[PDB]
Design an enzyme around this catalytic site. Structure first.
Site, PDB file in Angstrom:
ATOM      1  N   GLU A  35       0.714  31.260 -15.102  1.00 24.13           N
ATOM      2  CA  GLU A  35       0.040  32.262 -14.293  1.00 24.13           C
ATOM      3  C   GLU A  35      -0.481  33.409 -15.168  1.00 24.13           C
ATOM      4  O   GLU A  35      -1.605  33.884 -14.981  1.00 24.13           O
ATOM      5  CB  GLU A  35       0.993  32.829 -13.230  1.00 24.13           C
ATOM      6  CG  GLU A  35       1.239  31.928 -12.027  1.00 24.13           C
ATOM      7  CD  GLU A  35       0.003  31.750 -11.154  1.00 24.13           C
ATOM      8  OE1 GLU A  35      -0.956  32.538 -11.302  1.00 24.13           O
ATOM      9  OE2 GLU A  35      -0.001  30.835 -10.309  1.00 24.13           O
ATOM     10  N   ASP A  52      -5.425  39.482  -8.796  1.00 16.55           N
ATOM     11  CA  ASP A  52      -4.050  39.044  -9.004  1.00 16.55           C
ATOM     12  C   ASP A  52      -3.455  39.903 -10.114  1.00 16.55           C
ATOM     13  O   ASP A  52      -4.075  40.086 -11.165  1.00 16.55           O
ATOM     14  CB  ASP A  52      -4.008  37.566  -9.396  1.00 16.55           C
ATOM     15  CG  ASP A  52      -4.633  36.675  -8.343  1.00 16.55           C
ATOM     16  OD1 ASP A  52      -4.476  36.981  -7.144  1.00 16.55           O
ATOM     17  OD2 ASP A  52      -5.261  35.663  -8.710  1.00 16.55           O
ATOM     18  N   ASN A  59      -1.225  38.578  -5.508  1.00 16.68           N
ATOM     19  CA  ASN A  59      -2.516  38.927  -4.913  1.00 16.68           C
ATOM     20  C   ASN A  59      -2.599  40.215  -4.096  1.00 16.68           C
ATOM     21  O   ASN A  59      -1.745  40.487  -3.261  1.00 16.68           O
ATOM     22  CB  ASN A  59      -2.992  37.747  -4.068  1.00 16.68           C
ATOM     23  CG  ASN A  59      -4.414  37.911  -3.601  1.00 16.68           C
ATOM     24  OD1 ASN A  59      -4.665  38.330  -2.475  1.00 16.68           O
ATOM     25  ND2 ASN A  59      -5.358  37.593  -4.476  1.00 16.68           N
ATOM     26  N   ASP A 101       7.785  32.916   2.219  1.00 18.54           N
ATOM     27  CA  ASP A 101       6.729  33.082   3.211  1.00 18.54           C
ATOM     28  C   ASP A 101       6.187  31.802   3.842  1.00 18.54           C
ATOM     29  O   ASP A 101       5.065  31.788   4.356  1.00 18.54           O
ATOM     30  CB  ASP A 101       5.577  33.891   2.602  1.00 18.54           C
ATOM     31  CG  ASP A 101       4.784  34.657   3.645  1.00 18.54           C
ATOM     32  OD1 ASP A 101       5.415  35.256   4.544  1.00 18.54           O
ATOM     33  OD2 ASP A 101       3.539  34.672   3.567  1.00 18.54           O
TER      34      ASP A 101
END
Length: 129
Positions: A35, A52, A59, A101
């Site tokens: 990432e 990001d 984000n 989430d």
């Protein structure tokens, strides 16, 4: 700051990410590697107007406020700038909410494309955890 591989592994384990929600430490180190290549100052602008931020590329459209993302929500209740610090605490706490989430680690596209289903234990080699 650019973390060494084991240095980050230690930091993450210290913040309780090893096995969090069933994801081994290797998964998190691998996600971070692809990432942001372990760079806490990494930023990536998206074509939807969002950006990001940090080591785990969180984000701005839903998790943090950078004051320039349309209809953005700040679910982690923090400025995106806080995700660019040398201390990963802010990123880790926010990440813990993201992984829970409803999509697991699939939320991180780089994790899904380069880590998912691989031998992630390799990312912890040589580390005295």
């Amino acid at each position: 700051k650019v973390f060494g591989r084991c240095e980050l592994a230690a930091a993450m384990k210290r913040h309780g990410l090893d096995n969090y929600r069933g994801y081994s430490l290797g998964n998190w180190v691998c996600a971070a590697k692809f990432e942001s290549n372990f760079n806490t100052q990494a930023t990536n602008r998206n074509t939807d107007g969002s950006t990001d931020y940090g080591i785990l590329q969180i984000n701005s459209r839903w998790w943090c406020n950078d004051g320039r993302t349309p209809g953005s929500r700040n679910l982690c209740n923090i400025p995106c700038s806080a995700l660019l610090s040398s201390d990963i605490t802010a990123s880790v706490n926010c990440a813990k909410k993201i992984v829970s989430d409803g999509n697991g680690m699939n939320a991180w596209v780089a994790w899904r494309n380069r880590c998912k289903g691989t031998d992630v234990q390799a990312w912890i080699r040589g580390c005295r955890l």
